[PDB]
Design a protein around this ligand. Structure first.
Ligand SMILES: [Ca+2]
Ligand SMILES: [Ca+2]
Ligand SMILES: [Cl-]
Lengths: 208, 61
């Protein structure tokens, strides 16, 4: 694995003095801060997103995304999406993003809770899933998403412990083709019910 | 040299005794393209095994 700084962010100096995240663009009501990005806050009817400024061209890759979804309800909304897509996702009704993309979304759907892998070829408006309660966990939840030899695997650290390497299997998609070049991204949304959707770090690795 | 070891440690925020490009970004408003040029140069010159991390010996050459 080679760590790829230009497709990554993390604390404790995550945001620059002008409020930007180096190498990433943010939109909607995403709020970057020194130790995390609040991609959508626990207010009604929010959308926000953060996307890499440039495309990555990695044949094989792995991302480790550390996040929290926190709210007062036993039920919350809407959730968070981790993306690899040919184009930067404009705003829309899909966890803060547009409903047509070319690539793959890993959706943490609160309103369940379920984690679902959705592929798209840039011409449509669920390939595998698992049930995990990723809300209101005592330690950060982590998703490790690996694309290697045409197989997409999602592993989840459910945040019940402070062991950052305690990943368990969620889902896998075999024989998957995705864009050769694309942006990495995160989006989140809320509705009438609303959680804080916080991403502490997004760490991208090229695999060889 | 002790100043230099201090520079390395003070920028190793995750405490893995390695610097990556994000940590290096803090160790220098400079544009992101100029930042990228500088970080890429450091990694090219220092990162022997091309894993995106440099240790202290590699940093100090
Ligand atoms: Ca470090
Ligand atoms: Ca190295
Ligand atoms: Cl890292």
């Amino acid at each position: 694995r080679r760590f790829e700084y230009k497709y990554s962010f993390k604390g404790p100096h995550l945001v620059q003095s002008d409020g930007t995240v180096p190498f990433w663009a943010h939109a909607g009501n995403a709020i970057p801060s020194s130790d995390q990005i609040r991609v959508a806050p626990s207010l009604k009817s929010q959308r926000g997103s953060v996307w890499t400024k440039t495309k990555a061209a990695f044949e094989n890759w792995e991302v480790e995304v550390t996040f929290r979804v926190t709210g007062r309800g036993r039920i919350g909304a809407d959730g968070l999406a981790i993306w690899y897509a040919e184009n930067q996702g404009l705003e829309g009704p899909v966890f803060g993003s547009a409903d047509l993309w070319n690539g793959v979304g890993i959706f943490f759907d609160s309103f369940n809770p379920a984690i679902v892998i959705i592929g798209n070829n840039g011409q449509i408006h669920a390939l595998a899933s698992c049930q995990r309660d990723f809300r209101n966990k005592p330690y950060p939840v982590r998703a490790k998403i690996t694309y290697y030899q045409n197989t997409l695997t999602v592993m989840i650290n459910n945040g019940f412990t402070p062991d950052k390497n305690d990943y368990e299997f969620c889902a896998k998609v075999e024989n998957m083709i995705i864009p050769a070049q694309g942006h990495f991204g995160i989006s989140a949304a809320t509705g009438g019910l609303a959680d804080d959707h916080d991403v502490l770090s997004f760490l991208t690795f090229q695999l060889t | 040299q002790e100043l230099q070891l201090h520079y390395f440690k003070m920028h190793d925020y995750d405490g893995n005794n390695l610097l990556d490009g994000l940590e290096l970004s803090t160790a220098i408003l400079m544009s992101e393209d100029e930042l990228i040029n500088i970080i890429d140069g450091v990694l090219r010159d220092d990162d022997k095994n091309n894993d995106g991390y440099i240790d202290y010996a590699e940093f100090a050459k």
